[PDB]
């Protein structure tokens, strides 16, 4: 007999991280993986997800064939587990993350990785720039634009009072990690090499900008 609630909570947290649906950085151990897999097996309506993630043990065995109703039901199951949008690419992210976690060896220090192996056309940033580029100009714009900056002291005072208890550092961390994860997921989904040199050089540019 196992505690359904604890296993469900561990599964929820680990899947939240492994789906890139949350920025909560909590050190995850092998025990959380064991709990999430056991809960996935035990719960009847998560059997599809459990089989999906268990197929990742061998790299040569790929995703089971699911008819549209099955995919929709699994999407509803994932949504219920996360109580949050969620779609097929989230499932692909989860599959890749769990595959890399499972095939990884037992080790003393947490391994830091980047999203990869999701979604034939291995491209770079410039070809995507050109290509998607036109697909953009192809579309006609929706709106045509052809500005109040009020400094109402009382109103800004009330806004500051509302914002004052918020730990600015936490807000910056959340925003930056959200932008980073969205950029990484867009790169991986588009099958484009994510050049972290450029992304880190963005921060380096900000740092060099400040001190002048």
């Amino acid at each position: 007999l196992i505690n359904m609630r604890r296993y469900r909570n561990a599964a929820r947290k680990l899947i939240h991280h492994y789906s890139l649906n949350s920025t909560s950085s909590t050190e995850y151990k092998i025990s959380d993986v064991v709990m999430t897999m056991i809960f996935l097996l035990r719960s009847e309506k998560y059997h599809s997800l459990f089989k999906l993630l268990e197929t990742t043990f061998d790299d040569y065995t790929c995703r089971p064939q699911m008819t549209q109703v099955q995919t929709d039901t699994l999407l509803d199951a994932v949504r219920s587990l996360l109580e949050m949008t969620i779609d097929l690419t989230t499932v692909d992210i989860m599959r890749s993350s769990f595959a890399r976690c499972f095939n990884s060896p037992i080790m003393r220090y947490a391994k830091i990785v980047l999203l990869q192996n999701v979604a034939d056309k291995r491209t770079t940033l410039e070809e995507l720039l050109i290509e998607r580029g036109e697909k953009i100009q192809m579309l006609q714009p929706q709106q045509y634009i052809n500005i109040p900056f009020c400094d109402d002291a009382e109103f800004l005072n009330r806004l500051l009072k509302h914002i004052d208890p918020y730990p600015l550092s936490r807000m910056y961390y959340n925003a930056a990690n959200t932008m980073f994860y969205t950029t990484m997921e867009n790169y991986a989904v588009s099958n484009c090499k994510f050049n972290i040199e450029d992304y880190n050089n963005i921060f380096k540019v900000m740092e060099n900008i400040r001190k002048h």
């Binding site: 450029d198 050089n201 380096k204």
Partner: peptide, 30 residues
Amino acid sequence: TDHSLFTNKLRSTMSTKTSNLLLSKFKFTI
């Protein structure tokens, strides 16, 4: 394709005339 040109094309005018940038409030690293 290369964000590193920002430091040269901003510090010439912006670093001595405008305010501080929002992303410069904290040092971000991967």
